[PDB]
Design a protein around this ligand. Sequence first.
Ligand SMILES: Cc1cccc(Nc2ccncc2S(=O)(=O)NC(=O)NC(C)C)c1
Ligand SMILES: Cc1cccc(Nc2ccncc2S(=O)(=O)NC(=O)NC(C)C)c1
Ligand SMILES: [Cl-]
Ligand SMILES: [Cl-]
Ligand code: NA
Ligand code: NA
Lengths: 870, 870
Amino acid sequence: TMDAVPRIDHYRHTAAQLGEKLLRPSLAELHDELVVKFGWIKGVLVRCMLNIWGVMLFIRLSWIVGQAGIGLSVLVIMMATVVTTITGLSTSAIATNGFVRGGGAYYLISRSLGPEFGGAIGLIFAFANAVAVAMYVVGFAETVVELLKEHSILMIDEINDIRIIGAITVVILLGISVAGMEWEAKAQIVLLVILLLAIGDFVIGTFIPLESKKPKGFFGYKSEIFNENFGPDFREEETFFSVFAIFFPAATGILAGANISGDLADPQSAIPKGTLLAILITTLVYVGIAVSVGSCVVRDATGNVNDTIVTELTNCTSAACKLNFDFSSCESSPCSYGLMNNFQVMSMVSGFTPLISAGIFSATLSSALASLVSAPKIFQALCKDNIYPAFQMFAKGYGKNNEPLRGYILTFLIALGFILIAELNVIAPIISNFFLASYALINFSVFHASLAKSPGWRPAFKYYNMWISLLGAILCCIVMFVINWWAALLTYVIVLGLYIYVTYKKPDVNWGSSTQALTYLNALQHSIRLSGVEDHVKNFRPQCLVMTGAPNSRPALLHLVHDFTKNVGLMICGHVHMGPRRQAMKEMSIDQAKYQRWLIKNKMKAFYAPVHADDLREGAQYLMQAAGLGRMKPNTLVLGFKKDWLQADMRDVDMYINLFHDAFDIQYGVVVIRLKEGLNTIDVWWLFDDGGLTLLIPYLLTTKKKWKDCKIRVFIGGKINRIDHDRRAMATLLSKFRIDFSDIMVLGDINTKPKKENIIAFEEIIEPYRLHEDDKEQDIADKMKEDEPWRITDNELELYKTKTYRQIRLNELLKEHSSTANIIVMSLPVARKGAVSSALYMAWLEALSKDLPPILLVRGNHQSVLTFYS
Amino acid sequence: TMDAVPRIDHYRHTAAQLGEKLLRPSLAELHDELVVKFGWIKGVLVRCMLNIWGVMLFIRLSWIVGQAGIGLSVLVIMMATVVTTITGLSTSAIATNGFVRGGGAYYLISRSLGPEFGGAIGLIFAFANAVAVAMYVVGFAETVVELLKEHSILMIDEINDIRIIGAITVVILLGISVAGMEWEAKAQIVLLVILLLAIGDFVIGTFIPLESKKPKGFFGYKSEIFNENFGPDFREEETFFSVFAIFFPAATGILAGANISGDLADPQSAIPKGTLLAILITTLVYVGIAVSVGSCVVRDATGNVNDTIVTELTNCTSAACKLNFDFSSCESSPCSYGLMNNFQVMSMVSGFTPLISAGIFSATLSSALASLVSAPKIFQALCKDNIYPAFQMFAKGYGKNNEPLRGYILTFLIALGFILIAELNVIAPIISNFFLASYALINFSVFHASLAKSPGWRPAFKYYNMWISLLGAILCCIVMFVINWWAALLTYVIVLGLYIYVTYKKPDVNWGSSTQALTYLNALQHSIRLSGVEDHVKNFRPQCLVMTGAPNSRPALLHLVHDFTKNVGLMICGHVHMGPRRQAMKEMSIDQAKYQRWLIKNKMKAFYAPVHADDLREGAQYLMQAAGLGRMKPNTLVLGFKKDWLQADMRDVDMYINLFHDAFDIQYGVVVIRLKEGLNTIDVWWLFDDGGLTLLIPYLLTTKKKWKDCKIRVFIGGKINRIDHDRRAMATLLSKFRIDFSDIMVLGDINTKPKKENIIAFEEIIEPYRLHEDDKEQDIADKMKEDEPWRITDNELELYKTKTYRQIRLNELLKEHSSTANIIVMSLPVARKGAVSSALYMAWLEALSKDLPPILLVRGNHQSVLTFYS
Ligand SMILES: Cc1cccc(Nc2ccncc2S(=O)(=O)NC(=O)NC(C)C)c1
Ligand SMILES: Cc1cccc(Nc2ccncc2S(=O)(=O)NC(=O)NC(C)C)c1
Ligand SMILES: [Cl-]
Ligand SMILES: [Cl-]
Ligand code: NA
Ligand code: NA
């Protein structure tokens, strides 16, 4: 049947080849008459879980649960979890749209809402990961240094030992990462097993209370300790929000699995479930460990065997005394340790202490490895789009699975430098702010997509309410402020600067962002609003349709039309295409884009309006009948003077004059512009009341900065002995309209016979098109029907001598008075259709406008365009 | 010449008679073939000066100067003058645009920025003036009560005497106001003369030092007092902002002259200059009096001759002794005189004593008279505007000059009630905030008019910078908050409530406000923005041109098309008008308004688009070639099934089919809707790949609240023995597009001969259109060019039997399967142009769709409309 059935091969044209077996027929033919890929578990779940988990489970979780209450600590965890889950829901929604080629969160953000935000967030996120690797390596070095300092071993000052260990660790991590994407997965699995072993060791040792640890804070699940550990016992210059700020970074790292989207077996399924499961499991483990530590250890303790453990005569109505006096009465002296003074509680409540030490080692190393892997991927994805041209390179992949070795080396260098600094406690909040900004950008991506009701939003993952996403972005910003407000300001400024730079760069890319859909929707909504507004005389605007063909053919005329339309009124540059329909469609499709881009590149607020018809008359008919939307429709027809009418087929001149006639018939106002295309005052000779357009146009000219210094001087026609009366009337009328005029000149020389020379010149010019009916018999009635109506009938030439003499005399007056004007505006002669031939009308116009400064012959609708009523 | 020269009579038609000869010729006729008025001084200057001056020049200015030094008091006056001068500049700008028919600031505000704000501000301002009448009368009563209590002539308490005196004065003022406008002006002049006499008396007395007043603070213009008082004191619980709030109401009252616009000889010349002169003179007098009082009286004093006045040896480091010791050394014991404890200081520092009291009487009475005059004016103007229908009563005018007698009575009643309350100290801030809100609305009117760039702005008064006006409105809001913050919140709430009520009432009025111009400018700017956005498959929208004629003939089809276009994509209702051009233009002009209003009233976000042409074919050509603006152009022709084609001239059917053909030639998509107009699943039978529109339309259908429950079930064609493979392929394709489907059905019964009965029925239906070439001879070729291309040839009928049987069998299948669907979407058969006659195409469509639920035959553009990439 030649009509192809729906087939995936038809739509598959970017990630594969359709081939000969799949090719949808075009409408014309029917019409025209004749590599490593990971699963969701090992690719998203494990990476997300390992990135989320860190030293908080073994260092600060006990301190947080002590400073705050069990209930308040659980609340802090839950609120951080809200912020991360909302972010994860938004990420899954943005990832279940189409095929994600690679990159990571940068790819999702860019393909969602445009290269500007995409590049800003991509650079920020890549830098954040490149510095996070160094921070995690520094944490590992700190843990190793503390472990060796607890013994006698040491090489150099603590800082230098930290630097050495960090450098060795970073070198090893870079080697492992360069080894490949499978070795890294094996190492991640090993580290996860070790960390789970450490967690289980802590939980097992919390169930075995050894008396030797009694002088410590550990007691072994005593309900009295639990009841005493509620409430916010803040023993410092800190508060609830300080604890929240300290803990929240422990909820981050939820985008690790989506950072390697270019290596997943199948995104759109692995990312959502993997990320959500990782968030759930990590939050559950955090809550469990918080409660466990809060039900075993007392806040304060003075570890000492000599400490009274016999519970002699006393009351000391605290939780500790409820079972024994061990680690009691340090409310005045700074007792050694406890749930609020020792950060190794997890290492003591546990069993095998080196098991917990290895758990911390794995927690830091897994995060470092994940960051080192993820940052180069984002950088290479952002570089492959050439958003920052200098960053070209750092995008070449090596081996079967394209791996950014150059990005790997760059991340290694950045991490090594930041480790060489070795003092990173002041930079962590900036990195946290960067991550929070990325989360907020993802949430805003989802919200923007839901706001712009693009039919192609079509996300495969539900449970992504737009309002929840907006609330999540707001919460991300608020949490960003809650910790290191000045860091938040710095990140905001950096993001805004990058966004502005990218917007000004205007990169050559087009992805289908929600920004374009929202632009269309905004235009549609505003047009629909405007369609319900009644038109008023004082709200009239010149809405011009300029017949120019190619808008670049005559630039002076286009600029002039722009002057009195730019920012006030509509401007449609109409172009008529002629020839066969087939090639005409392709030519119009090319020209539309070419000329719209040309206009936008020259600051012309005009609309290109191509049209295909047999002749210019029919195309202009199309435009004057249909061009426009609702109330934004042309009311004025603008033409340029047919400067070549003298040497041109009379059919073209007839078409020009017929354009005039159809413009008048359709109740349009006609503006004919005659100026020298090759490349003071404004004189307005408006002698017939067209409704005011002749005055409105030059006033709008004066409203612009190009004609601000030009003063309007008016010319009118009067009767001798009555000059002053008419001048006063014109001055009063102009004052009522509030149009400033430098001078008013009343001329009685109109209606007088022009000179003999000018009449002779007009006759000589008009001779070739004269019919000369008198010199011929009735046979001439065939020329008037075949070689006509171009021919000028002697009857009309004698019946309209007044108008011809008026045109010649008016040209004389214009030359004598307005020769020094910057622009002339004059009433456009109107010829009744059927009474005057096209050739005679063209000759009238040519005689009127010949050899003068830029001139505009204006004939308005005759509907009132000005008013003096408020 | 029948062309009329410019003349004021053509444009003078709304506020004056046009006349016989005052009628410009219409473009068709030339182209078609064939009592008491006041001047600016007595009307604006005097009223503004008398309203601005209150009891602050004799009661509170001295206390203010005492509380804050000379410099700080001068600063307060200057800042209040900034707020008022900005307001006055905006008022002059808004009043020098057109002829101000009547009313006051209400008329200017309404004619500037729309009936909503106009009515809100008018009601609030009228109420403010009415209440101010009572407040000024209460001030007069208080002054008289104090004067008579100084001599113990009070009767029936004090408040109960204030009530009686105020009632008598209000009755007298009402009588004077009813007496006419000239008598009020004479009384105003008399009061002004008295007040100037009082001011001059104070200034003269300040130069006549008298030892009698030595016990009082007055000393005689001594420098030492000036240096002492040049600095702030701010005694008691007083602050700079508190004194500024106390003083600022003194600067108000600048709109008294503009409130009399309906009785001025020449507004646009009297209001601006008069108001500015009033502001200047009042501020100058205020500054002079403040400085003079600060240079002649000490802040503290104790008036007694027995007190120490010798100035003998005494340390008294304070500067009060610089000239004498009279009225000194009460820094601990409260004093009874001075610039901080006595308010009658002016009366004491003057010459004749009762003349100051007379000046106070005049100041308090002139403001009351002005308010009682102005409030009815504004109320009558806003009532003649008929913005609140219940208030149409208070619009009648009496006498030669329309005088709102009912408004006068209502204002008198309101003032009498508020005087009967007699305790207005708590209501003054409300009135001040109302006045400030009016000032802010005037400034925002000027700013909004400058924002929208309508050519009709054209204000005759310069010096009105838009940013200055916006700053003035902001300052007015801030000042109104500064004093009585809760009063400011209450006034804001009242203004917003009135604005919402007026917006929802939708009054039937059109004045060409700045809001409409801004709507147009916003739409144009958004369209210009959208014109620069590149096109992407992800952002494709269905932009439909529905050929419906009158948009109310078939409501069901319009609803159906609007369901999948509202909020997503454009919708243009195209109507073609035939007949003579002259009458056609008027018909289209009326129809455009009628149908746009009908659409907006019916909640259709569509655009009515009428064209004039001699046949539907070329009108649709106009629409498909030119309709739209920039990137908001249609790409899908929507047609209703010709249900009468069986009984209708075959020229109409040929035009319909050629509409199809031209739609395809212009590479448009085509949607044909067949549904019953007189009186839950969506079945998509898309069998040919059109690019995806057949699938994209029903999805958008399911995207709306009216089709949320319906589930999409798909039907495709397949080969027997491989049904499951094709079903899996279709399921995968739909999942990649993210279009939810309840079921997929693969049909092998296509391309099979339908029932004999159905073929016989099709033949019977098609019988009276066959060319019967075999039965006839070569002469039949004439019918192919005279009765054709309607006639169905025998060659085509025999050569396209497969397609006809396909249509019949497809209708059988749809009746068998989709008979219970809420809507059906099917692939529209495409007939090669020149190969199939129009009648056979129509019969194909009829056979395909009949005895079915609502159906959409969709033939997409064959360009990809869906994508599974991101
Ligand atoms: C890079 C960076 C910057 C700022 C804060 C964090 N913290 C995070 C982040 C994600 N998951 C857990 C944590 S954590 O709870 O602090 N555990 C942890 O081992 N942090 C190490 C840096 C010592 C990480
Ligand atoms: C109706 C009203 C409400 C609130 C404040 C004012 N004050 C104004 C207004 C205009 N010019 C001067 C003043 S004034 O300086 O306060 N003098 C004065 O006599 N006010 C009298 C009410 C006693 C007026
Ligand atoms: Cl992350
Ligand atoms: Cl006022
Ligand atoms: Na980790
Ligand atoms: Na007054």
